[PDB]
């Protein structure tokens, strides 16, 4: 061989590359972060999986969807889009899931309404239609939100760039076991922690509301029954 | 209603949006971070509040101002501005505080000199003139620095974008309780931790000095009496 | 004096400033992060330093070089460059070390092959030729990678911008002592932790592979003997 | 009186019944009320709404109407609450979707517009279901007659404290019990499905987290 080698740039790669170069050259990004104590969600997930016959598995990712959607309702301006004339604020929540592929992106439609298990089945049927088969173009439209998680790969924390119609991304880290302070005799206990980062447009999301959004998301996940409200 | 709804873009929002789009499209940003052990400052703050009759409250934010100013003296190049012909380095420290508002930004003038309590009273009188009343334009001029903290909202960590005359921002996280290693029988103790991030211009701040700046700031806060020097 | 003072912009500073302004205005950056448990490397480093007569010191930085190079082999696309027509993927690893200077950048050539001690001697002889003397232009060419560490200055975490021929940077934080959960009677033990961040081009590095890269790097350092494989 | 005489002279009624162990719902209700600032109270009646709606989804034929030519089966759930008044009947619209607290606020704002003020006729239209509870009055069990566009009613009894068998040393423990009766049209609801409906309702209430699914 030689010191270097070249391969032609892919077409779809240039499409994505145009989306990325464009959006990181236009949108004024900024990065907010928190930690989310995932133990209670782990208990409820174990239980609802026990109650289901094995008719359908449920991932942690589905709770992630349900909550981020309800939070988009509680704090609408994190769920809107910057058009040049007016800011466009949409009362229905679509959520697009950024799934890695040898970057296919199925959209879960109207997730603000449908329950957690129909969201899980929707994301799997969409993954089956994606990973090894063609999807209709209609599902790639980047509607109104994006979750993107890399905890399976062991990444602890990461900040993504967003796709330009939208104003935000949610990036999820690996769940881990940290030693928080406690009140028992030992003085401490183990806790499951997920580091969650959130990028925003910052012409539409001022920092106090990006924070408000992250607040509600944190409460729907720290205290899962409040998803019923 | 319908699937979406629109509202006209605000004028002041377009002013801010121009500032943000411009500066994140020009300044080559980068992000340095540390943790600051806030216990000692908590003791001194409790005490000076006890010694004051209640004639004036003092926040942690004021120590944040005092220290970041003195650090700007110790390492001048983090406190300068990039003009196209020459780098402009200013020997007086103004510091502008980024206060959230339904983003008003009062400036504390010559904070490098005045004491902590006059800084506290200055920031409150400026907040009273801002949150519910008009300020003179003269106070919005973005003079020479910016602190911006979102620990009240529970954000753990965040990286801001800066306003273009200046070269840096200080973003302050929530204070928290981590279990650091110790030398006693238990082998550990609780500590208050503030995660502090600092953005820089990076044509004027090379990484070793941004770090030097963060170093002095860390020492003025870890060891509050050295603010007397 | 006066309120401000000016000094002419330096020539080399404008060269660097052009590199930085250009690359942060073109490359779509994003930031991945992990923690690396450095204890085992500390044991092996202590031992190989004991076995060497003192004929040559070895830093932790050399293990950092060796591993990041071998990882560039295991996951080639983090070690390539974005030319406009085709992506250029190079089978030899050069690695450039970002050394602070009152920002000189020696390149370690073909580090994928040479052993750890020849890498250490190479980086010192290159530092001696740099810090107080002129280097040939041939060494500044920014070949195929960059490590950049600021743990000496006490920075905990930081995200750099990259130099445009390349697609990534490795930024290394300070090593620290965290209390991880354990299985002994105490229920916990101390651990050395290095926070490691990695920037990527993201037209060439999709997130799952940036993560794969960080994975292998983590394993070559958590388990140092596998560097022999 | 015309509505009642007509419907009990046309619809072939029949009565199914169960007992529902309400303890777990009592725990979750206490907790969500604790988490709310007192910004809004939540009654047991709201869980009753939420569950009966989701059950109408799981077993659609209990949530349909008998038109003479064809049976009409509707994919949206309205639920009308039979509130006593010196018999005003607000409808909670699209309860199959909205969350429990918005259902609670909806039923109170509808009660305020009803008990001492006029309501628009549009709210009396008897859309697609009816809950009707008389546990406040101490009735233990009761079977209602239904309003003719619809095919069913849910009648809720008083909650009480019965001694069920247990596995501990005492051999028994106290339990909160609600007797729940359900009337059906029986040209559209055959008994096995009326039972299926009552089954799902029983599970959404015995095990409240499954309302999330």
**Domain coordinates in residue numbering, chain C:** 1-229
Identify whether the C-beta of residue C181 lies closer than 8 Å to the C-beta of residue C173.
Answer: no
For chain D, the distance separating the N- and C-terminal CA atoms, rounded to the nearest angstrom, is: 41
Q: Do chains A and D touch (3 or more CB pairs under 8 A)?
A: yes
Question: Token pair 């240039």 is at which residue?
Answer: A14
Distance between CA A212 and CA A79 in Å, rounded? 13
Query: Helices marked H in chain D — which ranges?
Result: 2-8, 23-35, 44-58, 100-115, 191-206
Alpha-carbon distance A85 to nearest alpha carbon in chain D (angstroms): 33
- For chain A, the first-to-last Cα distance in angstroms comes to 64
Tokens of C17: 């400033």
* CB neighbourhood size of C36 (10 A): 22
Q: Two tokens at A201?
A: 């447009």
Which candidate, D133, D55, D59, places its Cα nearest to that of D95? D55
| Residue D143 is assigned to a ligand binding site | no
Token pair 């990076």: residue: B202
Extract the tokens encoding B200. Answer: 């820089």
* Residue C55: Cβ-neighbour burial (10 angstroms; 0-12, 13-18, 19+): exposed
CB C94 within 8 A of CB C133: no
Task: Quote the CA–CA distance of A226 and B13 in Å, as a whole number.
Answer: 34
d(CA A205, CA A71): 14
Give the dihedral sign, CA A174/B33/C152/C205: positive
CA D26 to chain centre: 17
Min CA distance, C168 vs chain B (Å)?
A: 15
| Contact between B168 and B95 (Cβ < 8 Å) | no
Is the Cβ–Cβ distance between B188 and B182 less than 8 Å? yes
Active-site annotation holds for B202 = yes
Extract long-range pairs of B16-23: CB within 8 Å, 24+ residues apart. B16/A203, B16/B103, B17/A28, B17/A203, B19/B163, B19/B164, B20/A28, B20/A202, B20/A203, B20/B161, B21/A26, B21/A28, B21/A203, B22/B164, B23/A28, B23/B161, B23/B162, B23/B163, B23/B164
In this complex, the residue of A206, A211, A215 whose CB is nearest that of residue B103 is A206
Q: What resolution (Å)?
A: 3.1
Nearest CB to A226: which of D32, D50, D207? D32
Q: Are strands B146-149 and B168-181 parallel, antiparallel or unpaired?
A: parallel
Q: Helix, strand, or coil here: C10? A: coil
B150 in Cβ contact with A207 (< 8 Å) = yes
C29 is known as an active-site residue? no
Q: Which of D46, D78, D122, D186 is catalytic?
A: D186
Range D28-37 contact pairs with CB under 8 angstroms and sequence separation of 24 or more? D28/A225, D28/A228, D28/D208, D31/A225, D32/A225, D32/A226, D32/A228, D32/A229, D32/D100, D32/D101, D35/A223, D35/A226, D36/D101
DSSP string, C138-174: GGGS--S-EEEE-TTTT--EEEPPPPTTSSEEEEEEE
Contact at 8 Å (CB) between C147 and C64?
A: yes
The Cα C144–Cα A154 span in angstroms is 25
Cβ distance C153 to B85 less than 8 Å, yes or no, reads: no
For residue D68, the 8-state DSSP code is S
Alpha-carbon span B76 to B145, nearest angstrom: 12
Tokens for B87, please give them. 């780098």
Angle at CA of residue B57, ends B53 and B58, nearest 5°: 120
- CA separation for the pair B195, B33 (Å, rounded): 7
* Residue of chain A whose Cα is closest to the Cα of D54: A115
Residue among C91, C180, C208 minimizing CB distance to A1? C91
Question: Do C86 and A6 make contact, defined as CB atoms within 8 angstroms?
Answer: yes
* Token output for A193: 């922690």
What's the CA gap between B59 and C136, in Å, rounded? Answer: 54
Q: Is A64 helix (H, G, I), strand (E, B) or coil?
A: helix
Q: Is the Cβ–Cβ distance between A222 and A194 less than 8 Å?
A: no
Burial class (CB in 10 A: 0-12, 13-18, 19+), B44: middle
Tokens of C61: 């930085």
Give A164's contacts in chain B (Cβ within 8 Å): none
Lateral strand order in the sheet of B107-108: B107-108, B95-97, B146-149, B168-181, B188-200, B30-37, C157-159
Chains that touch B (3 or more CB pairs under 8 A): A, C
CA–CA distance, B148 with B171 (Å, rounded to integer): 5
Interface test with B, best of A22, A30, A160, A180 (most B CBs within 10 A): A30
Q: What is the dihedral of CA C184, C187, C192, C197, to 10 degrees?
A: 130
Residue recorded with tokens 């953005």: B199
Q: Please state, in angstroms and rounded to a whole number, the distance separating the CA atoms of residues D159 and B220.
A: 64
**Closest Cα of chain C to A82: distance in Å?**
20
Q: Report whether C196 contacts C31 (CB < 8 A).
A: no
Distance separating alpha carbons of residues A24 and B20, to the nearest angstrom: 13
How many CB atoms are located within 10 Å of the residue A41 CB?
23
All residues of chain A having their beta carbon less than 8 Å from the beta carbon of residue D100 are 228-229
Helix H or strand E segment including C41? helix C39-51
Give the contacts of C168 (CB within 8 A, at least 6 positions apart): C78, C79, C145, C146, C162, C198, C199, C200, C201, C205, C210
Interface test with C, best of A28, A105, A157, A196 (most C CBs within 10 A): A157
Interchain CB distance below 8 Å, B161 and A212? no
Q: What is the largest CA-CA distance in chain C?
A: 65
Burial code (b: 16+ CB inside 10 Å, e: under 16) for C197-218 equals bbbbbbbbbbbbbbbbbbbbbb
End-to-end CA distance of chain C: 64
On chain A, the residues whose CB falls within 8 A of the CB of B156 are: 33-35
- Judged by a CB distance cut-off of 8 A, whether residue C158 touches chain B is yes
Closest partner CB to D213 (pick from A116, A223, A225): A116
The answer to whether A100 contacts C30, with C-beta atoms less than 8 Å apart, is no
Q: D 11-50 residues with CB below 8 A of A?
A: 28, 31-32, 35, 50
Q: Is C7 on the interface with B (CB under 8 A)?
A: yes
The token pair that represents A10 in the structure block = 């892919």
The angle formed by the CA atoms of residues A97, A101 and A105, to the nearest 5 degrees, is 25
**β-strand pairing of A107-108 with A157-159:** unpaired
CA B127 from centre of chain: 15
Contacts of B32 in chain C (CB under 8 A): 150, 155, 158
């Amino acid at each position: 061989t030689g010191v270097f080698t070249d391969i032609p740039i892919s077409n779809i790669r240039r499409v994505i590359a145009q989306r990325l170069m464009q959006s990181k050259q236009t949108i004024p990004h900024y990065y907010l972060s928190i930690d989310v104590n995932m133990g209670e969600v782990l208990l409820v997930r174990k239980e609802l999986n026990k109650i289901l016959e094995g008719r359908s598995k449920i991932s942690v990712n589905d709770f992630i969807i349900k909550a981020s959607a309800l939070a988009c309702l509680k704090v609408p301006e994190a769920n809107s889009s910057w058009m040049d004339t007016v800011i466009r604020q949409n009362h229905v929540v679509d959520v697009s899931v950024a799934v890695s592929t040898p970057l296919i992106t199925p959209i879960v439609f109207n997730a603000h309404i449908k329950g957690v298990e129909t969201i899980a089945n929707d994301v799997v049927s969409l993954a089956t239609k994606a990973r090894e088969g063609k999807l209709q173009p209609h599902e790639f439209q980047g509607g109104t939100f994006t979750i993107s998680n890399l905890g399976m790969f062991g990444i602890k924390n990461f900040s993504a760039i967003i796709n330009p119609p939208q104003a935000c991304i949610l990036a999820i880290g690996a769940s881990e076991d940290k030693l928080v302070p406690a009140d028992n005799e030992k003085g401490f206990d183990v806790a499951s922690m997920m580091s969650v980062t959130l990028s925003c447009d910052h012409r539409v999301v001022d920092g106090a509301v990006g924070a408000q959004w992250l607040a509600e998301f944190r409460k729907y996940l720290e205290k899962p029954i409040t998803m019923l409200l």
